[PDB]
Design a protein around this motif. Structure first.
Motif, short mmCIF file in Angstrom:
data_model
loop_
_atom_site.label_atom_id
_atom_site.label_comp_id
_atom_site.label_asym_id
_atom_site.label_seq_id
_atom_site.Cartn_x
_atom_site.Cartn_y
_atom_site.Cartn_z
N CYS A 1 -21.42 -37.05 104.59
CA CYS A 1 -22.27 -36.85 103.54
C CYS A 1 -23.10 -35.66 103.71
N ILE A 2 -24.09 -35.06 102.97
CA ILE A 2 -25.04 -34.25 103.16
C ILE A 2 -26.27 -35.02 102.98
N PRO A 3 -27.24 -34.73 104.06
CA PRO A 3 -28.67 -35.30 103.90
C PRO A 3 -29.40 -34.77 102.74
N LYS A 4 -30.23 -35.71 101.94
CA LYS A 4 -30.92 -35.42 100.99
C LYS A 4 -31.72 -34.18 101.19
N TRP A 5 -32.18 -33.44 100.27
CA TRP A 5 -32.93 -31.99 100.23
C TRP A 5 -32.33 -30.78 101.06
N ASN A 6 -30.87 -31.06 101.17
CA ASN A 6 -30.24 -29.98 101.84
C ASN A 6 -29.08 -29.29 101.00
N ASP A 13 -16.41 -27.46 100.18
CA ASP A 13 -16.23 -28.16 101.56
C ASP A 13 -15.44 -29.64 101.57
N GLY A 14 -15.50 -30.10 100.45
CA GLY A 14 -15.04 -31.52 100.17
C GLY A 14 -16.18 -32.75 100.35
N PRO A 20 -26.02 -42.17 97.61
CA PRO A 20 -27.39 -42.46 97.11
C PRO A 20 -28.24 -41.27 96.52
N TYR A 21 -27.24 -40.01 96.85
CA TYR A 21 -27.97 -38.61 96.41
C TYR A 21 -26.76 -38.14 95.45
N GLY A 29 -26.39 -25.17 96.34
CA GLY A 29 -27.54 -25.51 95.65
C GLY A 29 -28.42 -26.61 96.82
N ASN A 30 -28.91 -27.67 96.25
CA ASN A 30 -29.59 -28.61 96.97
C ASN A 30 -29.23 -30.04 96.63
N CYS A 31 -29.96 -31.05 97.43
CA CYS A 31 -29.77 -32.46 96.85
C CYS A 31 -31.01 -33.01 96.78
#
Length: 32
Positions: A1-6, A13-14, A20-21, A29-31
């Protein structure tokens, strides 16, 4: 998954932000 605020792109990318985000833009965009 992608780390928050990234950058997140589950439609290109799938891999969306971690459970939790959430991603704002499926393309680029951003998380938070």
């Amino acid at each position: 998954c992608i780390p928050k605020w990234n950058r997140c792109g589950p439609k290109m990318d799938g891999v969306p932000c971690c459970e939790p985000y959430t991603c704002t833009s499926d393309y680029y965009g951003n998380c938070s």
